[PDB]
């Protein structure tokens, strides 16, 4: 059965242990791959693609324009169109109006949005089918107006990429498909090749080799940033005595099935909760799951924390900073103001995380590992730069400029002072 | 004389090489900086003290002080009035970036929203030694203050005599800084990232610094320290676009304003169109630089600076977007009309009466901005830099009945039966 803790008892040391996921080295094997793709373009990408993926491709980048539209079963198409629709609407609503701030008359300042010109989106491939991720990444890129959108998705063993991913890629305006994975794919995007466009920002979780390539390349002469660390998936469920045990169990298992390193945490808030029934439901439901071996492995390092009340339970969750938080408690919505650290939040009894994973409209590319303490999930803003713009009239300069001279003199920066002084003289000499 | 290029002459390799700043490749700096970081990680306050003694020439018993325990310095009235004006303009501009948090309900019973929450603990790097940078203290502390950050650590190396300057302290107090870390360099960054015996561990570290500070930030964002950073914000850069209507002495003063920051600064002049007297700008630069206290720094920055001729404004702004400057001053006729063409720039100053100095100090925009070409994908510090945006969703039964079937389909396609069953089990119990 799952390990149980009583929150009031926990020492500082035990709490720090609870908030730390299983630990992380990788950089040694990845750099030669990075450097090689940097030095030898596509040819090296293909060598690593034969070794690691067992696929011989002559054309590792396709213009998505040149690809035929995939053939989908109509129920599948319909569902992906609903996901697109909701994700599009949710992300499109994040556009900021851009208004002038004019505190001092003649001193006009504004913040404007510009798209990142070129972006790379990594979606695991081969046997993986992750059209959901393709949408979570490409839809905001589409909305932001990124000119080049490269999607890295390694092909199946017969040279062909997952058709559901292609469908989503075409719907969301992906320009280039990079039929490749791993660190070779990342480096290809960060550095550019003969046929791969160079990108300015790389998004999307992958394996150790992907994450490592991303982390190396962000600090490199490639001049590239990345979205976040987004490692093994996580869910923290808060449940009280009104939660249905089989539903609580099903939510825990929904993310535990992602892999044996996933982390799942149940916080029981208050009295009257049937922990035996929950445990019982977890074991039974896990036994009948196709991926029950991954889930059982993930549950082997999962845990239950008992909190005296909802306030203590949310306090624990805030310390943990879970990728996903499900709050299955009475009047869940009222607790929103107490949430501090959580990638994405699911409120009430009819909101399994599965809905956010797939089609609610929110983005499932989210910070794991504790990184929700300082990173947000992918959003429209992840694809934008905000440039500040200011303009002064003569009068504006007369009002503000003397303050600036004063401050510059204080810092010992006389040239900063004189850029103002010379202009004020010129204004006086015509006035 | 400043080196000159004509865009229409250059090959692609030549053109692309003008993107390069006068900075060391990152790996060389990581070698210099790594052992410092690990030293502070292993050995705490002792290591920081050792570095502060060696490099800042000061022996401190307390390297961290609680700001509430420090005296309120007394400032000359005019100085005080000027910083209070800057505070007020920076506050107003940043406070206006607060987002409304409207609910989206595409499908009935499917409600989603994005809400802002502050980063709990932040570290702010204010450069020092012979730099006095109270302006940067405001640029960083004011938005932290507006966001609600609970722990705010300000790091600032003690000046020649061995003291944190009083103007930095005034600004820190007015903006709610909680702790002052009286160190600088990569050892300051490490102390904040890892925490020490007396330095709070922070979640995010902000601020401009020299090549070594910047490299420390970049290294620690990949570390097990669990820390993020704002951006690579290194030595200041300005690109000025000037036409025939620009006054040459004003153009020269703008270039020099930022050249004086240090020998590793870079300044670019792009002449747009005809009629510009480049020799007058050059003479004006030379004459002005010779009268500057820091003319030495400025002359060294100018040695890797250059002038580019562009046939028109379109080509000028295209070049600027490639360079991707920290700061862009557009001193051309109808400057405001060119705003739509600007793609990569940290902060832009439009017209003839808008020297970068005003945004450096008090216009209200943020001066902590990406350098090196990082304006291609990073923004300057803003309110959002101090926030996380959490997505929140809630479905009614009706919402789940409508959306849930699509979710089951998608989860089936991906081979994720447990994701499907968290919906199916709810829908079955509804139907029972
Ligand atoms: N739970 C994952 C991280 O948000 C996303 C996902 C995709 N498919 C199923 N789940
Ligand atoms: N130009 C610097 C980087 O934006 C900011 C500054 C402070 N004091 C004078 N200038
Ligand atoms: Zn999932
Ligand atoms: Zn400056």
Author numbering:
A (entry chain A): 42 to 65, 69 to 475
B (entry chain B): 42 to 473
What is the paper's account of this structure, in its own sentences?
HDH (EC 1.1.1.23) is a bifunctional enzyme that oxidises L-histidinol (HOL) via L-histidinaldehyde (HAL) into His in two sequential reactions, each coupled with a reduction of one nicotinamide adenine dinucleotide (NAD+) molecule to NADH. We show three crystal structures of Zn2+-bound MtHDH complexed with: (i) imidazole (IMD); (ii) HOL; and (iii) His with NAD+. The three structures reported herein are isomorphous, with three dimers (AB, CD, and EF) forming the asymmetric unit. The MtHDH monomer is composed of four domains.
HOL coordinates Zn2+ with N and Nδ atoms. More precisely, the N atom occupies the same position as Wat1 in the MtHDH/IMD complex, whereas the imidazole moiety of HOL is bound in a manner similar to IMD. Like IMD, HOL also forms an H-bond with Glu455*. The O atom of HOL interacts with carbonyl O of His408 and Nε of His368. Upon HOL binding, a significant change takes place in the coordination sphere of Zn2+. The Oε of Gln299 substitutes Wat2, meaning that, in the HOL complex, the metal is coordinated only by the protein and the substrate atoms. One important change is a different conformation of Gln299. In the complex with HOL, where Gln299 no longer binds Ser277, the latter has an altered conformation. Although Gln299 belongs to domain II, this domain shows few conformational changes, whereas the majority of the rearrangements concern domain I. The most prominent movement involves a loop region from Pro273 to Ser277. Other conformational changes involve loop Pro168-Val173 and the loop with the N-terminal side of helix α10, Gly248-Tyr253. Rearrangement of the latter region flips the ψ angle of Pro249 by almost 155°, from −53.8° in the MtHDH/IMD complex to 151.3° in HOL complex.
